[PDB]
Design an enzyme around this catalytic site. Structure first.
Site, PDB file in Angstrom:
ATOM      1  N   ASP A 649       0.413  -1.144  -0.241  1.00 18.65           N
ATOM      2  CA  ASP A 649       0.129  -0.041  -0.188  1.00 18.65           C
ATOM      3  C   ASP A 649       0.522   1.225   0.323  1.00 18.65           C
ATOM      4  O   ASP A 649       2.099   1.105   0.285  1.00 18.65           O
ATOM      5  CB  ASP A 649      -0.984  -0.086   1.301  1.00 18.65           C
ATOM      6  CG  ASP A 649      -2.131   1.067   1.637  1.00 18.65           C
ATOM      7  OD1 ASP A 649      -2.666   1.021   0.593  1.00 18.65           O
ATOM      8  OD2 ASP A 649      -1.612   1.717   2.137  1.00 18.65           O
ATOM      9  N   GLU A 678       1.904   0.223  -5.012  1.00 20.66           N
ATOM     10  CA  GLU A 678       1.090   1.781  -5.539  1.00 20.66           C
ATOM     11  C   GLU A 678       2.527   2.301  -5.896  1.00 20.66           C
ATOM     12  O   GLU A 678       2.881   2.706  -5.022  1.00 20.66           O
ATOM     13  CB  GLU A 678       0.582   2.109  -4.401  1.00 20.66           C
ATOM     14  CG  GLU A 678      -1.161   1.631  -5.172  1.00 20.66           C
ATOM     15  CD  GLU A 678      -2.183   2.419  -3.356  1.00 20.66           C
ATOM     16  OE1 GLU A 678      -2.253   3.274  -3.924  1.00 20.66           O
ATOM     17  OE2 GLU A 678      -1.817   2.267  -2.964  1.00 20.66           O
TER      18      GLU A 678
HETATM   19  O1  LIG Z   1      -5.006  12.029  -0.197  1.00 16.88           O
HETATM   20  C1  LIG Z   1      -6.458  12.098   0.235  1.00 16.88           C
HETATM   21  C2  LIG Z   1      -6.951  11.243  -0.951  1.00 16.88           C
HETATM   22  O2  LIG Z   1      -6.367   9.993  -0.699  1.00 16.88           O
HETATM   23  C3  LIG Z   1      -7.361   8.633  -1.563  1.00 16.88           C
HETATM   24  O3  LIG Z   1      -6.831   8.406  -3.095  1.00 16.88           O
HETATM   25  C4  LIG Z   1      -5.761   8.181  -3.278  1.00 16.88           C
HETATM   26  C5  LIG Z   1      -7.334   7.763  -4.557  1.00 16.88           C
HETATM   27  O4  LIG Z   1      -8.010   7.479  -4.605  1.00 16.88           O
HETATM   28  C6  LIG Z   1      -6.270   6.622  -5.893  1.00 16.88           C
HETATM   29  O5  LIG Z   1      -7.010   6.740  -6.968  1.00 16.88           O
HETATM   30  C7  LIG Z   1      -4.945   6.813  -5.763  1.00 16.88           C
HETATM   31  O6  LIG Z   1      -4.331   7.704  -6.247  1.00 16.88           O
HETATM   32  C8  LIG Z   1      -2.946   7.663  -7.521  1.00 16.88           C
HETATM   33  C9  LIG Z   1      -3.809   7.913  -8.650  1.00 16.88           C
HETATM   34  O7  LIG Z   1      -4.769   6.503  -8.563  1.00 16.88           O
HETATM   35  C10 LIG Z   1      -2.826   7.921 -10.246  1.00 16.88           C
HETATM   36  O8  LIG Z   1      -2.923   7.694 -10.841  1.00 16.88           O
HETATM   37  C11 LIG Z   1      -2.023   8.948  -9.930  1.00 16.88           C
HETATM   38  O9  LIG Z   1      -3.105  10.182  -9.478  1.00 16.88           O
HETATM   39  C12 LIG Z   1      -3.389  11.450 -10.615  1.00 16.88           C
HETATM   40  C13 LIG Z   1      -3.809  11.507 -11.495  1.00 16.88           C
HETATM   41  O10 LIG Z   1      -4.503  10.429 -12.429  1.00 16.88           O
HETATM   42  C14 LIG Z   1      -3.590  13.119 -12.410  1.00 16.88           C
HETATM   43  O11 LIG Z   1      -4.994  12.726 -13.265  1.00 16.88           O
HETATM   44  C15 LIG Z   1      -3.973  14.397 -11.847  1.00 16.88           C
HETATM   45  O12 LIG Z   1      -4.296  14.319 -11.141  1.00 16.88           O
HETATM   46  C16 LIG Z   1      -4.963  15.851 -12.039  1.00 16.88           C
HETATM   47  C17 LIG Z   1      -6.197  15.971 -12.000  1.00 16.88           C
HETATM   48  O13 LIG Z   1      -6.254  15.284 -13.668  1.00 16.88           O
HETATM   49  C18 LIG Z   1      -7.256  17.468 -12.402  1.00 16.88           C
HETATM   50  O14 LIG Z   1      -8.548  16.916 -12.125  1.00 16.88           O
HETATM   51  C19 LIG Z   1      -6.507  17.664 -11.746  1.00 16.88           C
HETATM   52  O15 LIG Z   1      -7.500  17.641  -9.962  1.00 16.88           O
HETATM   53  C20 LIG Z   1      -8.715  17.991  -9.603  1.00 16.88           C
HETATM   54  C21 LIG Z   1     -10.149  17.647  -9.109  1.00 16.88           C
HETATM   55  O16 LIG Z   1     -10.391  17.125 -10.797  1.00 16.88           O
HETATM   56  C22 LIG Z   1     -11.441  18.391  -9.011  1.00 16.88           C
HETATM   57  O17 LIG Z   1     -12.015  17.403  -8.707  1.00 16.88           O
HETATM   58  C23 LIG Z   1     -10.581  19.311  -6.840  1.00 16.88           C
HETATM   59  O18 LIG Z   1     -10.042  18.561  -6.741  1.00 16.88           O
HETATM   60  C24 LIG Z   1     -10.376  18.982  -5.395  1.00 16.88           C
HETATM   61  C25 LIG Z   1     -11.704  17.365  -4.883  1.00 16.88           C
HETATM   62  O19 LIG Z   1     -12.751  17.913  -5.129  1.00 16.88           O
HETATM   63  C26 LIG Z   1     -11.459  18.423  -2.877  1.00 16.88           C
HETATM   64  O20 LIG Z   1     -12.699  17.083  -2.897  1.00 16.88           O
HETATM   65  C27 LIG Z   1     -10.234  17.738  -2.348  1.00 16.88           C
HETATM   66  O21 LIG Z   1     -10.066  16.854  -2.591  1.00 16.88           O
HETATM   67  C28 LIG Z   1     -10.204  15.868  -1.397  1.00 16.88           C
HETATM   68  C29 LIG Z   1     -10.987  14.766  -1.465  1.00 16.88           C
HETATM   69  O22 LIG Z   1     -12.502  14.904  -1.480  1.00 16.88           O
HETATM   70  C30 LIG Z   1     -10.577  13.326  -0.100  1.00 16.88           C
HETATM   71  O23 LIG Z   1     -12.101  12.434  -0.193  1.00 16.88           O
HETATM   72  C31 LIG Z   1      -9.092  13.220   0.118  1.00 16.88           C
HETATM   73  O24 LIG Z   1      -9.316  12.647  -1.179  1.00 16.88           O
HETATM   74  C32 LIG Z   1      -8.788  10.983  -0.898  1.00 16.88           C
HETATM   75  C33 LIG Z   1      -9.283  10.565  -1.865  1.00 16.88           C
HETATM   76  O25 LIG Z   1     -10.814  10.018  -1.953  1.00 16.88           O
HETATM   77  C34 LIG Z   1      -9.077   8.644  -1.858  1.00 16.88           C
HETATM   78  O26 LIG Z   1      -9.385   7.833  -2.205  1.00 16.88           O
HETATM   79  O27 LIG Z   1      -8.939  14.759   0.508  1.00 16.88           O
HETATM   80  C35 LIG Z   1      -8.769  15.029  -0.692  1.00 16.88           C
HETATM   81  C36 LIG Z   1      -7.668  16.580  -0.179  1.00 16.88           C
HETATM   82  O28 LIG Z   1      -6.378  16.378   0.548  1.00 16.88           O
HETATM   83  O29 LIG Z   1      -9.265  18.711  -3.194  1.00 16.88           O
HETATM   84  C37 LIG Z   1      -9.480  18.153  -3.952  1.00 16.88           C
HETATM   85  C38 LIG Z   1      -8.039  19.620  -4.796  1.00 16.88           C
HETATM   86  O30 LIG Z   1      -7.083  19.477  -4.258  1.00 16.88           O
HETATM   87  O31 LIG Z   1      -8.635  19.489  -7.956  1.00 16.88           O
HETATM   88  C39 LIG Z   1      -7.774  19.076  -7.799  1.00 16.88           C
HETATM   89  C40 LIG Z   1      -6.892  20.214  -8.354  1.00 16.88           C
HETATM   90  O32 LIG Z   1      -6.604  20.533  -7.071  1.00 16.88           O
HETATM   91  O33 LIG Z   1      -5.663  18.003 -10.727  1.00 16.88           O
HETATM   92  C41 LIG Z   1      -4.760  17.210 -11.002  1.00 16.88           C
HETATM   93  C42 LIG Z   1      -3.622  17.384 -11.313  1.00 16.88           C
HETATM   94  O34 LIG Z   1      -2.470  17.902 -10.030  1.00 16.88           O
HETATM   95  O35 LIG Z   1      -2.128  14.090 -10.768  1.00 16.88           O
HETATM   96  C43 LIG Z   1      -2.771  12.714  -9.995  1.00 16.88           C
HETATM   97  C44 LIG Z   1      -1.645  12.543  -9.111  1.00 16.88           C
HETATM   98  O36 LIG Z   1      -2.348  12.868  -7.341  1.00 16.88           O
HETATM   99  O37 LIG Z   1      -1.311   9.573  -9.028  1.00 16.88           O
HETATM  100  C45 LIG Z   1      -3.060   9.178  -7.155  1.00 16.88           C
HETATM  101  C46 LIG Z   1      -2.174   9.354  -6.298  1.00 16.88           C
HETATM  102  O38 LIG Z   1      -2.193  10.636  -4.858  1.00 16.88           O
HETATM  103  O39 LIG Z   1      -4.194   6.192  -4.506  1.00 16.88           O
HETATM  104  C47 LIG Z   1      -4.797   7.814  -3.666  1.00 16.88           C
HETATM  105  C48 LIG Z   1      -4.086   7.342  -2.979  1.00 16.88           C
HETATM  106  O40 LIG Z   1      -4.158   8.833  -1.239  1.00 16.88           O
END
Ligand SMILES: OC[C@H]1O[C@@H]2O[C@H]3[C@H](O)[C@@H](O)[C@@H](O[C@H]4[C@H](O)[C@@H](O)[C@@H](O[C@H]5[C@H](O)[C@@H](O)[C@@H](O[C@H]6[C@H](O)[C@@H](O)[C@@H](O[C@H]7[C@H](O)[C@@H](O)[C@@H](O[C@H]8[C@H](O)[C@@H](O)[C@@H](O[C@H]9[C@H](O)[C@@H](O)[C@@H](O[C@H]1[C@H](O)[C@H]2O)O[C@@H]9CO)O[C@@H]8CO)O[C@@H]7CO)O[C@@H]6CO)O[C@@H]5CO)O[C@@H]4CO)O[C@@H]3CO
Ligand SMILES: OC[C@H]1O[C@@H]2O[C@H]3[C@H](O)[C@@H](O)[C@@H](O[C@H]4[C@H](O)[C@@H](O)[C@@H](O[C@H]5[C@H](O)[C@@H](O)[C@@H](O[C@H]6[C@H](O)[C@@H](O)[C@@H](O[C@H]7[C@H](O)[C@@H](O)[C@@H](O[C@H]8[C@H](O)[C@@H](O)[C@@H](O[C@H]9[C@H](O)[C@@H](O)[C@@H](O[C@H]1[C@H](O)[C@H]2O)O[C@@H]9CO)O[C@@H]8CO)O[C@@H]7CO)O[C@@H]6CO)O[C@@H]5CO)O[C@@H]4CO)O[C@@H]3CO
Ligand SMILES: [Ca+2]
Ligand SMILES: [Ca+2]
Ligand SMILES: [Ca+2]
Ligand SMILES: [Ca+2]
Ligand SMILES: [Ca+2]
Length: 1055
Positions: A649, A678
């Site tokens: 993880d 991951e």
């Molecule tokens: O850390 C807390 C979160 O933890 C958990 O997340 C896990 C994922 O579920 C899991 O899939 C994996 O993530 C990895 C992923 O699988 C890989 O592919 C990669 O991710 C990259 C991605 O593929 C690329 O696309 C790019 O991302 C860009 C994106 O495409 C673009 O649109 C934009 O992002 C913007 C969003 O679209 C927009 O909606 C908003 O996001 C806000 C959001 O709305 C808000 O709620 C808040 O997010 C909260 C969230 O709600 C909480 O639930 C919690 O998140 C957790 C996940 O839910 C878990 O499942 O906390 C969050 C805040 O800490 O704030 C968001 C903004 O901060 O705005 C976004 C831009 O600001 O831009 C990006 C380009 O930067 O790059 C990706 C890299 O991250 O790698 C991933 C590794 O993180 O693993 C996760 C494990 O933690």
């Protein structure tokens, strides 16, 4: 040493308040630290406040919006600084203030003064500090007291600290038994070591590159580090006359490793059975005392033994009799914790525990080799599937499962085994028979979500209520239900499940009542994914029929044996070494950080706070003794539980070097163990080289590829709202069957096809294909959100998937994304088409438990704590758990609108669709293992044998055509039956015709012919001339039959 200047507080009193606000007033003191050192009487005429009301803070009475107005000068002042009396319209809420000299900010930060938190509305601030203090004394002690933890004792003689650069006096003070604080004479009279400026050595900058820009200081070569590490150490800096500049707490993990790790690594830890008795050993290099407390079965202290400290290692040990086997025990720690700054006293379970009492309250001495803890035959249990060669590994086809998701709902599993390890032994249950069938068809590995000891399920069953039990039981154990809008059901006489079903009728985006009850259920049920480590090397207790003592050990092994022996699958464990469940000196589940405070957790470089980028309490695998704990823990899972592979993880939060180290260690036990994890981007690259997709190229350490995943599913995990529907994938008809919201262009669609083709060839950096514009590209040249798309050296380093425990299920993504005109049967074929890109690809194949049953979580994105209701998998095949209520509003509330628009487009899958999808699924897995060509293992071999047709700018959109060469240009004939294979995935609503193979005597695979009307290739036509007609939404596997010599086959084109 008497010539030493004595470090002291300012020779001025600690300040009281200047004035106290009256009604409709607030008061701001500026505590003039510089003018408290005094000399010249201070002039505050140019001090002023900028005051304004906006929408969040609006209490000010007559705020002057003119930024250039500097006339809000102090109401008064004394020797400690000026103060301002500010009129108000109200005594609740807040006000906005910037503190200035002229128009320059003395605090570069909009300040909010919350009356709610400062009730006397009389606050103090200091220049260059955004903190609002309740009183000048607080601010004064902030400036002239201990604060933060930005000093880093990183080896025996090197302290890194900002606060001491170009200061005349720099010292490391230390106190064994109290917190270093000024005298009754305002003097720091505790013992200290003297520190002289120096230069960061090469070994320290290599070790701690994120600190290499810190001002460095030398300690005498004769300092007794053991004595200082026993208590509090505080780095202090002072002016030439002795007045204190700053004082901060010290982070010691570096010097602990430099001092102790070499000796400590040579020892073995925990309660260890030997031929003479039992040896207890715990690593606690800063503890003042460690006592071994022995407990009876009913948890009475029956002995207490002061342990022997080994001064080379900082380990503590004690040897007792062989009769201590089975005994419960804790370590009674006497140890300073920097977080509380107290010498704490508490009993802690063993971090090397191998057996536990109920709910992990006590550790227990165990000999895991005892035959009483083994099922019959255990010692001879072997892997049903080879993992030795890269071709062995490529065959891995993973079914990612959870103990409750498997059996919680199966009425054909004996009731007492539901949600238990032993459900896997229920040979006639629907669940086990379905798994056996999947295994016969080519699923090869079960991957288990956390079955180590997790923290977030109460293992005392009296404190738990599950939805299959009376609602009255839920009321008894969950006192929030009593005052909830569901209180009336406490008398209902029905089960929670019956109530949740009843709640389905009126459940809507406006009345999310199913989710409302379930959020209460979730607090006290047996359900969690369990990414919440309590003890790393004991099985979880709630999954045992008996969580008290060693019973779980034998039940775990009985399950492991059943999977390998009854089901024919290898077993992978999810492991979570990247964080602990809790830290600090008080929390119930802080184990590592109670015993060796601030060593096992990653800390912020300036505050010393435990970081939470993982979710929780970030761990420090870069520290040597935690690296050892990880390796030792994996050793037990490998040898004592016969685990075939491990999924790390958030592996990206681990140094690459530490992962490879652990791997070489485990490979010396079993050479065929497989590691993957991951490998995203942890934002830790400044501290070490992280274990990421990019950095692991060539290592043989696998990583989930998010490339094919996003291309086939559509969008990304952070989509919400309309974007969930707009961002169609290859599997849901991007650019060929658009829904009413999307603007996906043909070029965007072909780009997803590039990532998908690249993934089906193992997502290599060096694989060469023709891209969406007809240009020659290397894998690494295909873009993926800016990163190089292809990153691997061999396909065994890539795990492809289109569904996983986290984020939305595949079916729920198809439901968000499919056009209205796509009927239920077409959506089932979209699921199969999506999975075909994984199952027929060269990457290791990975899938979520239940994709073969169209698994739904009712659009829940993050179901880790959504209980049995939303995570349900129905092995009686009545439905796919779709449309069972709106998902949890706290994480999916912003999706209610799009959910309600798409949810009822077609009927919910029933038994006919479930059976059809399972046949589809087993057809795909049987195809994957039907030929060595699908699973070549070696990347250079992929490059020599795998190619694609229907590429370039005029490709037929959505038609994936892959060829696998088994002819002479490639090398030897790895397959005796065929000279080549064609994989054709027609993810499109049009039937299509291939002419690329005209004249070749191509023919359909026997597997698909035998499935007949039930096949993904039903209706495919191979004409006499070798042209192939593919139905809409079909998957066809064709072959060039072999004659008695390796033929020409399907030579890869050199591009
Ligand atoms: O850390 C807390 C979160 O933890 C958990 O997340 C896990 C994922 O579920 C899991 O899939 C994996 O993530 C990895 C992923 O699988 C890989 O592919 C990669 O991710 C990259 C991605 O593929 C690329 O696309 C790019 O991302 C860009 C994106 O495409 C673009 O649109 C934009 O992002 C913007 C969003 O679209 C927009 O909606 C908003 O996001 C806000 C959001 O709305 C808000 O709620 C808040 O997010 C909260 C969230 O709600 C909480 O639930 C919690 O998140 C957790 C996940 O839910 C878990 O499942 O906390 C969050 C805040 O800490 O704030 C968001 C903004 O901060 O705005 C976004 C831009 O600001 O831009 C990006 C380009 O930067 O790059 C990706 C890299 O991250 O790698 C991933 C590794 O993180 O693993 C996760 C494990 O933690
Ligand atoms: O009205 C739309 C905005 O509404 C909301 O803003 C209100 C605030 O919430 C509210 O608190 C109050 O603002 C006060 C503020 O909080 C205080 O800090 C203070 O502001 C003073 C500041 O502290 C001083 O340093 C100084 O500002 C100078 C500044 O330092 C200097 O650099 C320069 O500023 C120029 C920028 O450098 C330059 O980039 C450009 O600004 C861009 C801007 O970067 C860009 O984003 C865009 O602005 C958008 C904005 O991003 C949107 O969010 C939206 O603004 C709303 C806010 O989000 C709400 O918070 O729309 C904007 C588009 O119009 O475009 C800008 C180009 O115009 O130019 C900058 C100016 O030349 O100059 C100043 C020199 O003084 O003084 C500051 C005050 O004078 O006090 C504030 C009270 O006035 O009120 C806000 C509503 O008015
Ligand atoms: Ca106050
Ligand atoms: Ca547990
Ligand atoms: Ca729960
Ligand atoms: Ca960091
Ligand atoms: Ca051949």
């Amino acid at each position: 040493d008497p010539q030493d200047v004595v470090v002291r507080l300012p020779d001025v009193a600690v300040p009281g308040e200047a004035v106290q606000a009256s009604a409709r007033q607030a008061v701001i003191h500026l505590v003039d630290i510089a003018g408290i050192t005094s000399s010249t009487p201070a002039d505050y005429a140019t001090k002023n406040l900028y005051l304004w009301n906006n929408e969040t803070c609006d209490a000010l009475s007559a705020p002057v919006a003119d930024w250039n107005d500097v006339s809000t000068t102090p109401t008064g002042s004394d020797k400690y600084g000026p103060y301002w009396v500010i009129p108000l319209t109200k005594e609740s809420g807040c006000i906005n203030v910037i503190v200035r000299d002229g128009t320059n900010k003395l605090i570069d930060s909009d300040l909010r003064v919350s009356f709610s938190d400062f009730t006397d509305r009389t606050v103090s601030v200091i220049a260059g500090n955004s903190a609002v203090y309740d009183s000048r004394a607080d601010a004064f002690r902030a400036a002239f007291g201990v604060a933060l933890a930005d000093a880093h004792w990183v080896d025996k003689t090197t302290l890194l600290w900002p606060g001491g650069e170009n200061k005349p006096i720099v010292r490391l003070y230390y106190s064994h038994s109290s917190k270093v604080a000024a005298d009754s004479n305002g003097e720091f009279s505790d013992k200290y070591v003297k520190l002289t400026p120096t230069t960061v050595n090469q070994q320290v900058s290599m070790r701690f590159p994120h600190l290499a820009s810190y001002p460095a200081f030398k300690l005498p070569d004769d300092v007794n580090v053991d004595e200082l590490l026993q208590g509090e150490t505080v780095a202090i800096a002072a002016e030439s006359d002795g007045i204190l500049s700053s004082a901060t707490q010290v982070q010691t993990a570096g010097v602990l490793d430099d001092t102790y790790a070499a000796a400590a690594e040579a020892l073995s830890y925990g309660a260890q059975l030997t031929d003479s008795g039992v040896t207890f050993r715990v690593w606690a290099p800063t503890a003042q005392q460690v006592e071994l407390v022995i407990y009876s079965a009913d948890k009475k202290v029956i002995a207490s033994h002061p342990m022997t400290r080994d001064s080379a290692s900082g380990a503590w040990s004690w040897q007792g009799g062989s009769d201590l086997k089975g005994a419960f025990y804790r370590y009674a720690m006497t140890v300073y914790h920097p977080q509380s700054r107290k010498v704490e006293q508490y009993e802690v379970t063993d971090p090397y525990a191998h057996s536990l009492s109920t709910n992990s309250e006590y550790s227990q001495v165990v000999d895991l080799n005892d035959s009483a803890l083994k099922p019959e035959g255990w010692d001879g249990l072997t892997m049903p599937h080879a993992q030795k060669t890269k071709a062995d590994l490529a065959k891995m086809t993973i079914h990612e499962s959870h103990i409750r998701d498997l059996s919680a709902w199966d009425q054909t599993v004996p009731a007492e085994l539901r949600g238990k390890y032993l459900a896997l032994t229920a040979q006639e249950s629907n669940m086990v028979q379905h798994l056996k069938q999947l295994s016969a068809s080519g699923v090869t590995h079960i991957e288990l979500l956390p079955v180590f000891d997790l923290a977030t399920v109460n293992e005392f069953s009296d404190k738990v209520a599950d939805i299959q039990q009376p609602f009255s039981r839920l009321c008894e154990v969950n006192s929030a239900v009593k005052s909830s809008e569901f209180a009336g059901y406490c008398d209902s006489g029905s089960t929670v499940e019956e109530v949740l079903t009843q709640l389905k009728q009126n459940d809507s985006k406006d009345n999310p009542q199913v989710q409302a009850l379930n959020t209460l259920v979730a607090q006290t049920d047996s359900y969690n994914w369990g990414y919440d480590p309590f003890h790393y090397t004991v099985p979880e207790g709630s999954y045992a029929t008996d969580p008290e003592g060693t019973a779980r050990i034998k039940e775990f092994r009985t399950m492991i044996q059943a999977i390998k022996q009854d089901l024919g699958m290898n077993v992978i464990m999810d492991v979570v070494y990247n964080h602990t469940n809790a830290a600090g000196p008080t929390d119930r589940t802080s184990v590592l950080d109670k015993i060796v405070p601030w060593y096992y957790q990653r800390l912020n470089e300036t505050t010393g706070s435990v970081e939470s980028a993982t979710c929780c309490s970030d761990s420090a695998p870069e520290h040597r003794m935690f690296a050892k704990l990880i390796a030792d823990s994996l050793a037990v899972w490998t040898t004592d539980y016969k685990i075939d592979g491990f999924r790390f993880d958030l592996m990206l939060y681990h140094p690459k070097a530490q992962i490879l180290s652990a791997w070489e260690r485990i490979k010396a036990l079993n050479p065929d163990i497989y590691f993957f994890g991951e490998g995203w981007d942890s934002n830790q690259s400044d501290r070490f080289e992280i274990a990421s997709q990019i950095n692991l190229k060539g290592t043989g350490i696998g990583t989930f590829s998010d490339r094919l995943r996003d291309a086939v599913r559509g969008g990304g995990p952070f989509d919400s709202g309309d974007a969930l529907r707009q961002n169609q994938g290859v599997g849901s008809g991007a650019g060929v069957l658009p829904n009413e919201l999307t603007t996906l262009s043909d070029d965007q669609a072909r780009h997803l096809a590039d990532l998908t083709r690249l993934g089906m060839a193992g997502n290599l950096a060096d694989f060469v294909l023709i891209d969406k514009d007809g240009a020659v590209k290397r894998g690494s040249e295909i873009d993926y959100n800016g990163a190089p798309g292809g990153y691997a050296a061999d396909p065994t380093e890539v795990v492809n998937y289109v569904s996983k425990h986290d984020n939305q299920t595949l079916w729920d993504m198809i439901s968000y994304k499919a056009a209205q005109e796509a009927d239920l049967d077409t959506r089932v074929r979209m699921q199969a088409v999506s999975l075909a890109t994984v199952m027929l690809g060269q990457g290791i194949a990975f899938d979520q438990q239940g994709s073969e049953l169209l698994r739904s979580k009712s659009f829940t994105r993050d179901s880790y704590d959504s209980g049995d209701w939303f995570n349900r998998v129905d092995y009686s095949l009545q439905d796919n758990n779709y449309n069972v209520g709106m998902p949890r509003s706290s994480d999916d509330g912003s999706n209610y609108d799009i959910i309600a628009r798409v949810k009822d487009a077609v009927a919910t899958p029933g038994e006919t669709e479930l059976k059809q999808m399972t046949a589809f699924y087993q057809e795909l897995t049987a195809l994957r293992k039907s030929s060595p060509l699908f699973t070549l293992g070696d990347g250079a071999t992929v490059m020599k044998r795998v190619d694609f047709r229907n590429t370039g700018a005029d490709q037929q959109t959505g038609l994936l055509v892959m060829t696998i060469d088994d002819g002479m240009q490639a090398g030897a004939s790895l397959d005796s039956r065929v000279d080549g294979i064609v994989v054709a995935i027609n993810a499109a609503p049009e039937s299509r015709t291939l002419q690329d193979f005209a004249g070749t005597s191509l023919q359909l695979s026997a597997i698909q012919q035998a499935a007949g009307d039930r096949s993904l290739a039903s209706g495919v036509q191979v004409a006499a001339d070798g042209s192939v007609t593919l139905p809409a939404w079909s998957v066809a596997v064709l072959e060039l039959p072999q004659g008695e010599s390796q033929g020409a086959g399907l030579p890869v084109s050199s591009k």
